[PDB]
Amino acid sequence: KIPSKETPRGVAIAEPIIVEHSVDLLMVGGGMGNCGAAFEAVRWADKYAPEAKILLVDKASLERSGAVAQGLSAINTYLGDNNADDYVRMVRTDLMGLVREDLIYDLGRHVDDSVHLFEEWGLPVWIKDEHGHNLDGAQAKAAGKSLRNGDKPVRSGRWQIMINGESYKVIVAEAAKNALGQDRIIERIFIVKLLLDKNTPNRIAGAVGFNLRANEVHIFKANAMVVACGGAVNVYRPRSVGEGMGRAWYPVWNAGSTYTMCAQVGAEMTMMENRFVPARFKDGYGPVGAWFLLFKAKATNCKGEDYCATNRAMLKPYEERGYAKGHVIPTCLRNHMMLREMREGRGPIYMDTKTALQTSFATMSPAQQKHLEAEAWEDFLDMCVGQANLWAATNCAPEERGSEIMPTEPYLLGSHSGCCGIWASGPDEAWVPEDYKVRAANGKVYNRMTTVEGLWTCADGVGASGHKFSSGSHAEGRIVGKQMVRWYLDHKDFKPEFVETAEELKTLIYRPYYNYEKGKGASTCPVVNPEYISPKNFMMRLIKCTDEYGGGVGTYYNTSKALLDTGFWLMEMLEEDSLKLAARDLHELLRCWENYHRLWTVRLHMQHIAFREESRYPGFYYRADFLGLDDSKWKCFVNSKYDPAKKETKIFKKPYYQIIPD
Amino acid sequence: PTYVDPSKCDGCKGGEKTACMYICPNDLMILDPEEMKAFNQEPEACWECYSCIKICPQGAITARPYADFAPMGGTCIPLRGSEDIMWTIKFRNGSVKRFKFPIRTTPEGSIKPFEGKPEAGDLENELLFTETALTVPQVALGQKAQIADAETSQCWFDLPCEGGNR
Ligand SMILES: Cc1cc2nc3c(=O)[nH]c(=O)nc-3n(C[C@H](O)[C@H](O)[C@H](O)COP(=O)(O)OP(=O)(O)OC[C@H]3O[C@@H](n4cnc5c(N)ncnc54)[C@H](O)[C@@H]3O)c2cc1C
Ligand code: SF4
Numbered sequence: 001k002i003p004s005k006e007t008p009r010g011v012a013i014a015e016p017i018i019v020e021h022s023v024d025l026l027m028v029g030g031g032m033g034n035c036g037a038a039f040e041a042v043r044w045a046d047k048y049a050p051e052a053k054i055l056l057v058d059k060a061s062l063e064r065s066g067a068v069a070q071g072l073s074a075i076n077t078y079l080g081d082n083n084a085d086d087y088v089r090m091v092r093t094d095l096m097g098l099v100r101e102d103l104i105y106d107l108g109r110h111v112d113d114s115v116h117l118f119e120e121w122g123l124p125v126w127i128k129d130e131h132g133h134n135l136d137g138a139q140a141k142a143a144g145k146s147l148r149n150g151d152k153p154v155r156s157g158r159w160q161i162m163i164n165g166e167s168y169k170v171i172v173a174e175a176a177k178n179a180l181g182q183d184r185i186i187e188r189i190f191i192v193k194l195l196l197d198k199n200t201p202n203r204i205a206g207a208v209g210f211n212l213r214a215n216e217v218h219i220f221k222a223n224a225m226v227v228a229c230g231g232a233v234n235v236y237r238p239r240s241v242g243e244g245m246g247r248a249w250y251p252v253w254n255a256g257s258t259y260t261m262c263a264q265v266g267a268e269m270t271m272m273e274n275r276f277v278p279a280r281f282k283d284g285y286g287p288v289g290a291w292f293l294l295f296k297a298k299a300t301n302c303k304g305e306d307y308c309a310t311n312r313a314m315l316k317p318y319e320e321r322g323y324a325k326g327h328v329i330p331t332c333l334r335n336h337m338m339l340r341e342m343r344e345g346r347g348p349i350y351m352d353t354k355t356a357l358q359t360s361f362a363t364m365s366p367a368q369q370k371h372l373e374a375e376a377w378e379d380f381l382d383m384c385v386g387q388a389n390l391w392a393a394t395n396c397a398p399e400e401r402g403s404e405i406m407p408t409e410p411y412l413l414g415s416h417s418g419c420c421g422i423w424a425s426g427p428d429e430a431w432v433p434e435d436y437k438v439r440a441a442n443g444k445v446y447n448r449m450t451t452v453e454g455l456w457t458c459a460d461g462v463g464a465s466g467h468k469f470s471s472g473s474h475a476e477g478r479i480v481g482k483q484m485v486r487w488y489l490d491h492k493d494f495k496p497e498f499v500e501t502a503e504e505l506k507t508l509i510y511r512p513y514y515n516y517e518k519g520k521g522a523s524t525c526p527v528v529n530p531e532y533i534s535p536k537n538f539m540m541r542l543i544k545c546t547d548e549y550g551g552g553v554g555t556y557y558n559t560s561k562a563l564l565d566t567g568f569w570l571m572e573m574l575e576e577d578s579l580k581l582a583a584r585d586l587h588e589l590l591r592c593w594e595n596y597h598r599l600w601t602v603r604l605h606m607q608h609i610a611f612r613e614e615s616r617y618p619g620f621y622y623r624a625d626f627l628g629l630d631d632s633k634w635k636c637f638v639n640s641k642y643d644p645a646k647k648e649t650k651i652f653k654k655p656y657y658q659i660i661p662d
Numbered sequence: 663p664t665y666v667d668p669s670k671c672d673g674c675k676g677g678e679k680t681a682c683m684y685i686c687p688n689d690l691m692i693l694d695p696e697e698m699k700a701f702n703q704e705p706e707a708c709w710e711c712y713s714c715i716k717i718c719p720q721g722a723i724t725a726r727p728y729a730d731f732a733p734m735g736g737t738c739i740p741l742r743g744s745e746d747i748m749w750t751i752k753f754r755n756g757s758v759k760r761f762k763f764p765i766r767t768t769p770e771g772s773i774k775p776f777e778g779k780p781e782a783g784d785l786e787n788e789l790l791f792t793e794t795a796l797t798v799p800q801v802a803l804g805q806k807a808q809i810a811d812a813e814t815s816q817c818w819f820d821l822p823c824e825g826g827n828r
């Protein structure tokens with residue numbers, strides 16, 4: 001009855017074992033990024049470094065881990081007939097002008113090759129038949145048509161292609177597995193720290209983590225590594241605060257690890273001020289696109305009018321400066337026109353699918369009607385099942401009643417329609433500026449390497465180069481995978497060493513366990529206890545602070561220097577309080593470290609928006625005290641570098657080089 | 663969020679992987695070893711990705727749509743085969759819609775990542791092992807942005823305030 005007697009329900013938690021690993025190439029994460037990295041690295045190692053120990057570690061199991069967990073309905077990056085210059089041009093417009101164009105171009109001339117590999121591996125890809133009618137992957141194979149055979153995909157926009165990608169991730173994880181084998185892949189192990197070398201300055205040396213199935217602290221020594229662990233979600237308070245805390249657009253388990261693990265160790269960060277707030281179906285966040293273009297269903301306010309047309313004037317200052325001109329509005333400016341309809345109470349923003357369906361069903365045959373309905377529903381069943389559940393629940397089959405649109409709480413990501421992350425290195429060509437190249441102590445420049453020597457990142461990891469999506473994420477991993485094998489061979493005789501001992505690392509990882517053990521006697525209830533703090537409560541206290549002072553949903557994405565300052569004041573009592581986190585079981589120890597990653601990132605994101613004295617992303621967030629954009633003082637990137645020894649962050653401007661014209 | 667049907671769940675007696683517990687990307691599925699029944703240990707952290715619902719051999723796991731905004735009665739049930747997936751959507755009012763989609767063209771566990779493909783080439787160029795040539799920007803510029811920095815446009819000299827030698 002008394003709560004402290006009740007069983008913890010997680011795995012166990014007890015004094016950990018400590019198991020070390022000496023490895024040549026480490027890979028932290030197993031999403032789209034590292035599954036590309038592993039695939040590439042093995043091939044180069046099998047020829048040039050077959051004795052080299054390669055290891056991939058993942059929080060979950062590789063088969064389903066990451067954003068592509070329930071699969072996708074589209075691949076959003078595929079040139080094929082398109083040139084990588086208009087690719088850079090489009091990503092620049094969408095992300096408000098300030099992007100690393102060399103990284104985007106470099107990502108362009110590699111990306112299609114991954115998509116071509118995917119099909120070959122078993123991914124069902126949609127292809128136009130001959131009379132311009134859609135064929136699904138299974139029947140495209142049956143017909144004998146493929147991307148390998150250059151047959152032009154279905155495509156719902158210059159850059160995207162349609163797929164039956166429910167098993168997308170498992171197909172990719174399979175290729176990474178068969179290249180590595182269940183001997184270079186250890187799953188169900190969460191990495192928390194990242195250690196850098198005791199000897200040479202600014203050089204990476206290792207990583208610490210823990211097993212989620214048994215009490216073990218893992219210490220990894222390494223020569224070169226990728227940290228690609230996705231973006232940051234649940235850093236801001238969501239629109240559903242009960243059980244709906246799990247229904248976010250981007251995967252709820254993205255704890256902002258990639259961002260903090262590297263920033264914490266001295267890597268130069270970039271564009272952390274950038275966020276992404278998508279406009280999706282209310283509460284379930286399912287994709288809208290298909291319903292709009294397959295049936296011509298539009299967004300209407302309480303008056304039934306098109307708010308895009310009504311609020312055109314809002315775009316004047318931007319199009320005159322060349323940011324939006326002629327019905328090619330950036331995604332952020334699209335939901336900037338949405339917000340005024342909301343804050344002035346002319347909601348709800350409504351997709352009338354009822355009347356839009358009954359009109360389009362008149363100009364289609366009964367069998368042609370089943371086909372366009374089955375395409376549209378697949379956008380949920382292949383991409384976002386939670387939404388289909390909501391429609392099942394609310395009696396909202398599109399035939400009989402429409403649905404609501406709502407902009408989501410901010411998400412921090414670099415691979416999708418955002419660009420916050422880590423300052424990476426350009427390829428080293430004539431067309432790449434010198435400031436865009438890192439180049440190590442040995443003088444050579446390795447592609448996509450951080451300013452920390454020997455550390456790589458990709459896909460959500462690298463900032464200022466958004467719109468990679470599931471294909472670019474893989475392609476970037478491939479780029480890195482090679483550079484790591486290349487790095488190892490140039491630094492073959494390294495031997496890494498840490499300033500901290502294995503015991504010191506172990507007592508750090510399990511601190512929240514000791515916190516709980518030493519303080520549990522104080523209370524009859526394990527949660528309400530003055531000695532420590534629950535990870536679920538830490539989670540809540542943070543997302544509240546961020547919502548109210550960092551420009552979350554509650555404040556209509558609005559912030560200022562004053563609001564941020566109050567934020568920071570609470571933020572660093574929370575930083576202090578994190579030292580007194582508590583774990584009853586292994587699952588709680590996981591949350592304890594994830595929420596600590598969640599703090600460091602969301603704080604850094606705010607420190608960046610505090611610095612940039614303009615509102616570069618209107619509709620995503622506003623600086624109330626600096627409402628408009630300013631190309632005079634702020635046409636550039638905003639970078640930061642954390643000092644480990646001095647526990648100080650230095651936020652500075654970093655010049656932007658225009659490469660692709662227009 | 664997801665829950666387990668106790669009458670269907672056997673706790674995975676053979677092949678000592680607990681399918682649900684193994685697969686969950688968010689570490690939410692966990693087995694009670696004595697009872698040989700599983701559950702979701704933290705339902706409010708469920709992304710409702712169906713990973714565990716698909717992998718369950720007994721089919722014991724169903725999804726109750728988020729209680730704090732989704733009304734009762736509605737449910738989605740997959741049946742993921744070797745090369746295809748069948749969905750059945752049961753509505754609150756009793757309606758039923760069914761679907762069938764392709765998931766994979768090739769057999770499970772068959773990908774030979776390197777078989778047939780070129781061997782590793784030059785460690786010093788930007789070519790991946792499967793590539794032979796790469797595009798170079800149509801027209802490439804090196805135009806630095808340059809930022810004014812100075813907090814004033816003010817000038818108190820008579821002469822432009824440009825060649826600021828001191
Ligand atoms: C709802 C939504 C819809 C999307 N639709 C499309 C689309 O239509 N087309 C398209 O091309 N792309 C789409 N994407 C975007 C695409 O999924 C991402 O760009 C891509 O998955 C990013 O891959 P990643 O490298 O960041 O790794 P992710 O796939 O994000 O996975 C991260 C990996 O890191 C691991 N990890 C996390 N933390 C740790 C830890 N600290 N220690 C060890 N491992 C850790 C996780 O286990 C996971 O395996 C969509 C994404 C979302 C979720
Ligand atoms: S996979 Fe299914 S049968 Fe096995 S333990 Fe989980 S819920 Fe029970």
Ligand code: SF4
Binds near residue numbers: 709710712
């Ligand atoms: S639906 Fe997905 S995230 Fe939720 S418990 Fe099942 S496997 Fe985990």
